[PDB]
Amino acid sequence: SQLKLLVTRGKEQGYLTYAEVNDHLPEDIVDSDQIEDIIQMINDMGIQVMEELMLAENTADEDAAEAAAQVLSSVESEIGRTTDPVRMYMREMGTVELLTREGEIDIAKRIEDGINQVQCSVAEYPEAITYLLEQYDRVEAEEARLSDLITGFVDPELAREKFAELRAQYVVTRDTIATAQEEILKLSEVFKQFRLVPKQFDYLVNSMRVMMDRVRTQERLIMKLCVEQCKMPKKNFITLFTGNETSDTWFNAAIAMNKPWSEKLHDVSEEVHRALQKLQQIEEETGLTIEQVKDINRRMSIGEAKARRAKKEMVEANLRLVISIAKKYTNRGLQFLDLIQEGNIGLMKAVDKFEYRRGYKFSTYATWWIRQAITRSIADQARTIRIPVHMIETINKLNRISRQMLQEMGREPTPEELAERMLMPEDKIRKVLKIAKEPISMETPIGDDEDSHLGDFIEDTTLELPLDSATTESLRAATHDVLAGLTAREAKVLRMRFGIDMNTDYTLEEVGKQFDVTRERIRQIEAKALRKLRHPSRSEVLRSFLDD
Amino acid sequence: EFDAIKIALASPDMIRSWSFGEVKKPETINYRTFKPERDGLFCARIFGPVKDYECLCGKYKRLKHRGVICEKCGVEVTQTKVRRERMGHIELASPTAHIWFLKSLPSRIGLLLDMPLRDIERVLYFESYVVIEGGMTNLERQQILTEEQYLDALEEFGDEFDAKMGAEAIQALLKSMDLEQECEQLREELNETNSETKRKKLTKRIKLLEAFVQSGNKPEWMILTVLPVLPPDLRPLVPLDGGRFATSDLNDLYRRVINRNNRLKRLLDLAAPDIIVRNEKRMLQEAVDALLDNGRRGRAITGSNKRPLKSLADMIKGKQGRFRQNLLGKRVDYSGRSVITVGPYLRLHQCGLPKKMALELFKPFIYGKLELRGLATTIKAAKKMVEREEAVVWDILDEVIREHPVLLNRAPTLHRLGIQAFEPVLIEGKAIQLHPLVCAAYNADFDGDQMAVHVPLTLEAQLEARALMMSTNNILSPANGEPIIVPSQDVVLGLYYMTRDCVNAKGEGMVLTGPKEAERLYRSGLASLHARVKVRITEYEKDANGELVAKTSLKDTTVGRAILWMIVPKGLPYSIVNQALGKKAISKMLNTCYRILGLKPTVIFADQIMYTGFAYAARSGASVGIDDMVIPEKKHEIISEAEAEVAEIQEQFQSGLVTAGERYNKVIDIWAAANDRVSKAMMDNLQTETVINRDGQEEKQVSFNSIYMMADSGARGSAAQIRQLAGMRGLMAKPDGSIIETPITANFREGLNVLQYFISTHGARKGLADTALKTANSGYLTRRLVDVAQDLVVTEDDCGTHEGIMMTPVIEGGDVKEPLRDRVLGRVTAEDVLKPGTADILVPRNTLLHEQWCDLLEENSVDAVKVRSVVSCDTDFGVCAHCYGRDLARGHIINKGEAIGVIAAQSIGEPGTQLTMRTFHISSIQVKNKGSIKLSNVKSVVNSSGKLVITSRNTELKLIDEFGRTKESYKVPYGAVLAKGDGEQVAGGETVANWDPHTMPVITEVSGFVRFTDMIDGQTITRQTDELTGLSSLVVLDSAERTAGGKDLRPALKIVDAQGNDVLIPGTDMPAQYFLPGKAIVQLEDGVQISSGDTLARIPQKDITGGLPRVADLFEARRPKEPAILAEISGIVSFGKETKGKRRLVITPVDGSDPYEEMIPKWRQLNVFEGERVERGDVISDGPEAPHDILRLRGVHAVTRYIVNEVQDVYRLQGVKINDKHIEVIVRQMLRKATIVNAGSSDFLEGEQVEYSRVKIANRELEANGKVGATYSRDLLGITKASLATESFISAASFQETTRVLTEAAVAGKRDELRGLKENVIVGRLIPAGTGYAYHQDRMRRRAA
Amino acid sequence: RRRKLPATIILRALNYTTEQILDLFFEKVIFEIRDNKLQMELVPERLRGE
Ligand SMILES: [Zn+2]
Ligand SMILES: [Zn+2]
């Protein structure tokens, strides 16, 4: 490469100027950032770069010299090597297709079917319909808000009768458990005309997920005990376990196999019988079989993944949209990529709330949600001392009525003038304009000789001066003296009543219990001692501690 | 309290154990009630309470609840100091590489996995994937894939293969990797394979693996899974005036990390589109790296006010960081500062301290003494009394002050005599009165300068100002024994005016009965201060064994010298005061007073000299007037002659006889000669012009011109400055050396018109600007030499070696420049040195050569003395007391615990302040005196002519008289025609040898016919036609223009007899033929005679740098560009393949590795023949010698002698004197590194650079054993690389790149046993150098009990 | 501060071909066959200091 001759040139001369670095660069290096990083490479190894008795020192090195030389030899071929976040993201966002010109409705139909598959999957579950009849009865028996179960449908009282009708249909479906299959299809087709509340639906889904997790955990307790500890064979356990799934022959008639592995599961025999009874018992706790609800939530997760794998595409396109929208606040005290990230999160938010039913184009509404979320995150995490969002709106309207009142009234706004033009009480506007200013950095370069900073002059208001600690130890010694000039009655009771040379100062009753006397005697004793201490010969030394 | 400082990585469990609680929200405080918001960056629940012993809500405020964790807000009731040590932790939901261990260059992450850097940073930012044990199918461990490669991998290779992305992948990679397995594979690849540099890098990686195993580090800790947040009171958010807070940038950086981490948690729990998740992980990584070291991966972010936010790495590193600016030098209590004035009434140990500046520095002592004496009841009454300045406080203060020294310190404390301890004297005013004699120590005048005062508080600290740092104990400069109590300018002129004489003054020639009567005559007004007179003075002499034998006599002196004699202490002679007493003589008088009478008599002599000088300078009334600059009346005719010659040259230039540059040079030469003429005229008019009458006619004496008296006494002035006042100003100079030809022919006494003044302002402003830098970059050399040579301490009274330096006078050119008494004074000899006839056992081995033994040495005229040096001392981690000699100032012998390294650096750097900041450049022997001839490399032949010719190469000839001492030294060429030859004692007026640079002879051994063998013209020789003599010449040339047929072949001149037999070279059976390289014209013919070394082949035909850069470069040990190659091995030489820039120079030893050969840059003038036996440690081509060359060839004493002589050349060029002990110490730190030639029984690597002291001790204890040690080879480094290698990472992080040092320490897991001066100062302990050295020895004895 | 292109590239960018460029920056020495093999057209001043 040519930069090799440049490094050896700098090492020959002992320096390297911006002219030679601009010459010897890879010609098509169009990236000023990697330019800066490669000059920082050639400098971070040493030689040092400049722009024009140069005897200071070398500073480095035989270890980092060949390191930076290796990095240079590699970077001579570093073609697509911007290597910064803001440009890497733009690359990987423009690289993806902008395949969105009213294909949004096709994506929406995909989501529509995928979200109805999860609907029918749950609605084929007996215990969930029991839960729904439960909540119809409770929500109409005043357990929650009267519409705390359903998001409308395709009316309090005819709806309650509708739900009684659904309850009758499902309870006869339960009554007629073959004969149960047709009645559960009745169940599914009769619930298929309804629509639940997404929060109740969410608990539904999470309960299905706990079903799945617990069934797979008992799967683990069955398998890992022998299929992972005794090394239970794979394909025979497959063709026997799944394929039977109910009877005692899968385990009880398999312990009688006497195979090289069936001579290994007599250990876990009673344990896998517990697992068998748990299988059949959880089938009760769900009402129907394990296989049924299992493939139910399986096809439901199929539909959910089908839905999610389209929100991905539209968030790709609309994230190009978000990088479009975000650029109006590049100087709002927030990073640009953080702006784009808040916009992306709001974009997912709007994608799950975008509707084709109004026939509205995607951009105008997703940009609504995106401007909302981006201004939200700006107001939230752009200032160290968080003022709430309404305070930011108030300071903004104050500023917007400030530029106006300046261009009109000539001179300047004022709290009198602003409380005039704005509807505030002339004093919270005071505190608002007190609040708006930013903390100056403690590393501000001060206008001094030593390159001093603002953090060097910030004094300390909590420290007690060593004249004020040696004016407390002197006081402790003085009080120990003046208390020594006293009976053990007064001395003990005063050290105890106050915190003198002791732990927590007790009240009168505690002092009395220590002295077996009632509180009024304690008060008389302490008053006696303070009287005795008030006169000189016991007061001159303490009093000099009072500069008042 | 605590032993060494251990360092390593931080386990995420260790970082969770440091923390007192997670930090989940980016909240600093509430905006109305400024209490910490949460559970945020400022939290009372994690980082302790925000007020002392006070819960946050207020439910718990009494001390009785001490320690409680309040039920409401869980804020542990405790001190608010607790808010300054508790740490938090942020829990990164995704891993995050430590930027220190990914950009450390070499990347520790990168070089551990052996995955190159760009691959790592390409898997990092999710640009690619990296397999991690991708099953038994296709791939390598660290095989990086592109995205689509991984996509197609998951198709054809579904599972049993796992490639991750991002920092998670690097974490899994480091985790799965097993260090001992790969280390074994590296063993196999290192010992089953031989590819030199590949195995160098291989073994470097191997050493890194073994270090990562030796330490407790695990490689998977280089990825931050858990991030600890600094305690809040280190990154505080403080209320300013106006409610606008002030925050350190670390709050910004912690907030940016915490928001991004919370958003990554959010997006992870939304199943977000994974490109957005990639962006969040990337941004969080960038945020953590801005937090750890901003501006280390990309561009600094940002800051909020358009300036790069500083991060923790910025908090440590940088000139304005934490290791440097409050760790090594900090602000200090009990200290003041004031304008210094003079106050000549002070004794040399005391200084005036203002009452107002003393009542503030001693307030603790005054409060204590008031409360003690009962004058004030308590500390508060005492404070009030001092606050109103009661009448008794001045007695209490005079009692506090009495024996309490204070440290006075000027701003640029270049040398250690810049912080001196004085006893204070409560003076009235607000200006410190500083004793005049000390101002040369401080380098301080009273043009407004200020000084800082400190109070040594404790007992042990205020006996060090009394015993070490006191003004009276320090009268000698540590850089050279000469007393720095030199009286400077009013004192030397008072003494010059006093101790002088006039040809006829009042009371001349009257016998006086002692100094007392002379003083009474002078005070009475009956006899002048300089009236020649006879006084009976009685002087003492203690050459007796301590006893002073007296002697009285009528000296013929003056009244001034008489009065001055009363001041001199007892045991000094009268000739010390019986001259005119300039400044040089005035400080020599003090040096003799010291070297006879110790310290206390000299200390009293100093202020006596000072008081009497000031007194008689004031008595003299020596003013200065405008008539005291008597311009010589011959100046006008000299300038007329100069203008005449210049006009002559201008006409000869207009005539076409000289170039323009030649006219410029001739004009400048004329004006320079005229300026020297006018200055000599003005000085001849000034110095002697006083003409007086003694008993008649007239007589001239030394002038009493006030300005001449200042110039001659040495108080102020020279000939140059008086010349500018009286003669002409001569030629100015533009800043770049361009001498102006229009010379200022005026002085300041007469006017300067506009043009001359404007001309002079050029050099004026250049000089001013140059000393505006030399003040700014004041002590950079002392800093660079206190970095390399800091931790040396005299730690042993004797190592007991026998190795030293053969110190002798620097007898160069003519008479010596530096005698033996200068350079052997104060050093202990290495071996018993006998007389030249040996006569006795003159000087024992370990006798400190003080003044008496130097007397002994230069009575016997001893010329060479072996004296122990510090670069040969056998001590470990230090220097023996005897291998350093006598210590200056204190002047007895260095006592163990001297920090000789700091002193050596300061003594090379304070004198260096007096040197030029720029680096500047500059037939028959005229042998001088009578003496004998001295031969080195004696191989000479007497021609038939009778004169001598050196048949050797480097024969050095010396003129050495009957003294035993060498008096002249000379380098003789290869066979000059010596009029005088070998051992021939001759006298002056007799040249020792004639020569000619157009004549370098190839003189032979024997006489005989010069046949021509191995000579065929057209291939090696050239046809030089004798148009000058009428013959033919075949001159020897190389293969430069002749073809390659016989190009390498040398033209052999066969010196044979008249019969035709090959006469041998007497000594070796190879006959007396010569193979000739070019540059030697041959005027012989084939079959022609020559006498005993007749002219066979004849070869036809002082700048010194001096700037302080010529000392930074002398010490930095670099390589010159004309590097004189030397003789690597003994034996004979062969020349081989030519015309390449490296002609083969083979060296066949006598009995060694005979095929030895090297390269020769054939642009060079090679100045040695091929038949002469090369001697090891000898030069071949002539040019500047390289230090590393000498160090590898002739020995450590060779390099030390070279470095010492070069630095002493540049120091003696400016007259600035510095001892050589200091440069030997800097060298001893310079060549601190050994290298392993043979591994041997030793246990270092093959070619490993190890600490020479380490290899020394190891192979020494093996030599005590039965096993062969390692054959080391001593390196030689520059100060800025000998300092780079330091044992303790604390000091190394102090003066180096901090991130590199702490990364290396963290990976290696170094343990810093604090045993250096620069480490202990940082950790607040006693330096193990001086007063605390006994303490550190007791600590080392307690440890390992 | 970009890379140092040669100095004739800008002369070419100004639509100067090589011939008038060399006519711009140089002088001219004339040779001709005046019956003896390209005689030189000598100038007095130009042969100074040679
Ligand atoms: Zn509380
Ligand atoms: Zn020693």
From Swiss-Prot, chain B:
Cofactor remark from the record: Binds 1 Mg(2+) ion per subunit.
Class of enzymatic activity (EC top level): transferase
Effect of A720T: Resistant to antibiotics salinamide A and B
InterPro entries: DNA-dir_RpoC_beta_prime, DNA-dir_RpoC_beta_prime_bact, RNA_pol_asu, RNA_pol_N, RNA_pol_Rpb1_1, RNA_pol_Rpb1_3, RNA_pol_Rpb1_3_sf, RNA_pol_Rpb1_4
A cellular component annotation (GO) from this entry: cytoplasm
Biotechnology: Co-administration of salinamide and rifampicin or salinamide and myxopyronin suppresses the emergence of resistance to both antibiotics.
GO BP term, pick one: submerged biofilm formation
Consequence the record notes for mutating S760A: Resistant to antibiotics salinamide A and B
Binding site for Zn(2+) 2: C799, C873, C880, C883
Record note on modification: Acetylated on several lysine residues in the presence of glucose.
Transmembrane segments: none
Co-factor(s): Mg(2+); Zn(2+)
Modified residues (N6-acetyllysine): K958
Outcome of substituting F748C: Resistant to antibiotics salinamide A and B
Effect of N675D: Resistant to antibiotics salinamide A and B
Binding site for Mg(2+): D445, D447, D449
Keyword entries, A-Z: Acetylation, Antibiotic resistance, DNA-directed RNA polymerase, Magnesium, Metal-binding, Nucleotidyltransferase, Transcription, Transferase, Zinc
Positions that bind Zn(2+) 1: C55, C57, C70, C73
A Pfam family assignment: RNA_pol_Rpb1_4
Family of the protein in this entry: Belongs to the RNA polymerase beta' chain family.
Subunit structure: The RNAP catalytic core consists of 2 alpha, 1 beta, 1 beta' and 1 omega subunit. When a sigma factor is associated with the core the holoenzyme is formed, which can initiate transcription. The rRNA transcription and antitermination complex (rrnTAC) consists of RNAP, NusA, NusB, NusE (rpsJ), NusG, SubB, ribosomal protein S4, DNA and precursor rRNA; S4 is more flexible than other subunits.
Function field: DNA-dependent RNA polymerase (RNAP) catalyzes the transcription of DNA into RNA using the four ribonucleoside triphosphates as substrates. Resistance to the antibiotics salinamide A, salinamide B, rifampicin, streptolydigin, CBR703, myxopyronin, and lipiarmycin can result from mutations in this protein.
Classification via NCBIfam families: rpoC_TIGR
Protein name (record): DNA-directed RNA polymerase subunit beta'
Organism from which the protein derives: Escherichia coli (strain K12)
UniProtKB/Swiss-Prot annotation, chain C:
Disulfide bonds: none
Biological role: DNA-dependent RNA polymerase catalyzes the transcription of DNA into RNA using the four ribonucleoside triphosphates as substrates.
Family designation: Belongs to the RNA polymerase beta chain family.
Subunit text: The RNAP catalytic core consists of 2 alpha, 1 beta, 1 beta' and 1 omega subunit. When a sigma factor is associated with the core the holoenzyme is formed, which can initiate transcription.
This protein's name: DNA-directed RNA polymerase subunit beta
Annotated source species: Escherichia coli O157:H7
